Design a protein around this ligand. Structure first.
Ligand code: O0P
Ligand code: ZN
Ligand code: ZN
Length: 582
């Protein structure tokens, strides 16, 4: 315990030596508590005026307007240690899964060079405000990298000074850039080298993109078996056990030299022991520790979640096929049976799943899976919104399965080629596009974010009548050459100034491995929509009076936004649609 966290604690204690107060009205049972010190301050969500002015009908839809306004008693919960048979099932499965993932990959260190280019084009890594302002600055100064070297040589010693979590079912723990770097050095390879790609991992979809996920679920649907199962876990990050963290760390068994020692230190000193600074209003800072749960960086969290989820689901599949009889204790003939199952059918059983971090779809061999709940509940992966021992509901149609906040439609083009397109309730799509994160944004920055949403809609949601119209209207109201932007970048093919019809053709035809005929599409009118009734089912306003006035007078809304931005070069995209083409 305190040998490993103490140094980190001693250090923070002294940076606030005229504050430290061992409180006894501290709200922690599950989190160990060490003391407190003085602090003050707080980050809300702003409306994007460009998107809102061009989506007026939605100004009266509460599902949209409410999204822009605004359980930490789930972080203070506790999960029992699995039984011995569960622990054996998990260790055997984890050992076998790292081997399979490593068959065609070489673990390796990520570089300062790599880390630096990352910071300069942004994929929200999670830094702090203070010695430097942004992370952009700290990365150019060689002082920083001496801070990073001091800590690096400490980790090689088996000690930690500065790797401390900052807390704010969404709980996000930011660290100072230097600790993020050391995390990236050691584990970045999982993401950077695509360990959870579908080609490499069979269950994974890392790098896949929203235009590929539907085709993937459909491929899983082809497999002979029972229903498709899509159980969400109640607070996945909060149910990661010390035993889960030890099975993840076995990736170090695949490493060597310095790398191996660097990865071991991250696992031992920052994941399997943790120090967090939490802001308490009654406003002070509480310095609390615990061994279990998830608090890596967002990107390592994703790969380790995918790994442990693949593992849980192969085991749930094992329980459904009667590979083992009780989680209480595995016999020796049962270890032999588990191992031989993995060797004989493990790759086939991985190909029956689509797993994105904590999210999964499984098409098991048959419907025994639905009531195979003992290992899943004993690993602590307790299902959301169903009684502990009530069997899982199954989906009989792959176009009804929820995955990554979406469902997928099968859509036949006038020439017979088949698109599998992503979809979610349209109020959700319009409500997110109306929101900007952070403040201090020019009218040009706001316009360029609107343009990003519009281009995403044209590429992923072209089949929704209201989104194709609104996308053409936003792209008509923002200057033709202004570059789309984002502040927390799935593959993002809409982030470009290329012609959207040209990107559509590349994404949906040329690069789509499910399309045998590569004949390009010549205009947007070749590109189909969902059926009118399906469009309404998924939240369209077609048939409403508000919507008919909006569409008919769209050029007046476009002209309102153009007048606000000013005298710039604009394109009329509205004639790409039949009803505005005269
Ligand atoms: C809502 N329908 C008509 C409609 C109005 C505007 C655009 C459309 F694409 C279709 S309906 N009642 O299903 O025919
Ligand atoms: Zn450290
Ligand atoms: Zn839909």
């Amino acid at each position: 315990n305190l040998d490993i966290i103490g140094k980190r604690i001693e250090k923070i204690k002294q940076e606030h030596e005229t504050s430290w107060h061992y409180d006894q009205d501290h709200p922690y049972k599950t989190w160990a508590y060490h003391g407190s010190y003085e602090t003050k301050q707080t980050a809300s969500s702003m409306v994007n005026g460009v998107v809102r002015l061009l989506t007026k009908p939605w100004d009266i839809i509460p599902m949209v307007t409410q999204m822009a306004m605004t359980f930490k008693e789930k972080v203070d919960t506790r999960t029992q240690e699995p039984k011995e048979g569960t622990k054996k099932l998990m260790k055997i499965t984890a050992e076998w899964l790292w081997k399979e993932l490593g068959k065609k990959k070489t673990p390796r260190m990520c570089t300062r060079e790599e880390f630096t280019r990352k910071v300069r084009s942004n994929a929200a890594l999670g830094a702090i405000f203070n010695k430097w302002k942004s992370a952009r600055e700290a990365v150019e100064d060689s002082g920083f990298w001496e801070l990073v070297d001091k800590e690096r040589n400490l980790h090689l010693e088996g000690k930690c000074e500065t790797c401390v979590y900052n807390m704010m079912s969404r709980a996000i723990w930011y660290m100072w850039l230097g600790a993020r770097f050391l995390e990236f050095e050691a584990l970045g390879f999982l993401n950077e080298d695509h360990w959870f790609s579908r080609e490499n991992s069979l269950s994974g979809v890392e790098g896949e993109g929203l235009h590929k996920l539907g085709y993937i679920l459909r491929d899983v649907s082809k497999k002979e078996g029972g229903a498709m199962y899509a159980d969400d876990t109640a607070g996945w990050d909060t149910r990661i056990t010390l035993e889960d963290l030890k099975n993840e760390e076995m990736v170090t068994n695949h490493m060597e030299g310095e790398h191996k020692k660097l990865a071991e230190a991250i696992f031992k000193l920052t994941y399997q022991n943790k120090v967090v600074r939490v802001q308490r209003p009654t406003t002070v800072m509480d310095i609390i520790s615990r061994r279990d749960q998830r608090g890596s960086g967002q990107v390592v969290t994703y790969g380790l979640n995918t790994f442990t989820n693949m593992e849980a689901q192969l085991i749930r599949q094992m329980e459904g096929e009667g590979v083992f009889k009780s989680i209480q204790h595995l016999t020796v003939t049962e270890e032999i049976a588990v191992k031989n199952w993995l060797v004989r059918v493990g790759r086939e059983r991985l190909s029956r799943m689509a797993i994105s971090g904590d999210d999964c779809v499984v098409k098991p061999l048959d419907d025994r899976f639905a009531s195979a709940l003992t290992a899943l509940n004993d690993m602590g992966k307790v299902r959301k919104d169903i009684q502990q021992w009530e069997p899982s509901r199954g989906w009989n149609d792959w176009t009804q399965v929820p995955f990554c906040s979406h469902h997928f439609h099968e859509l036949i083009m006038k020439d017979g080629r088949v698109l599998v397109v992503p979809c979610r309730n349209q109020d959700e799509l319009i409500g997110r596009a109306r929101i900007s994160q952070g403040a201090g944004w020019s009218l040009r920055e706001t316009a360029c974010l609107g343009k990003s949403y519009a281009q995403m809609w044209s590429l992923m949601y072209f089949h929704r009548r209201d989104l194709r119209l609104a996308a053409n209207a936003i792209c008509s109201a923002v200057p033709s050459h202004w570059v789309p932007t984002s502040r927390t970048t799935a593959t993002h093919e809409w982030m470009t100034t290329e012609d959207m019809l040209t990107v559509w053709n590349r994404v949906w035809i040329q690069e789509n491995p499910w399309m045998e005929d590569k004949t390009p599409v010549e205009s947007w009118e070749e590109i189909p929509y969902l059926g009118k009734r399906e469009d309404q089912w998924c939240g369209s306003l077609i048939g409403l009076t508000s919507r008919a006035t909006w569409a008919k007078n769209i050029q007046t809304a476009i002209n309102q936004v153009r007048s606000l931005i000013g005298n710039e070069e604009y394109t009329d995209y509205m004639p790409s649609m039949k009803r505005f083409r005269r």
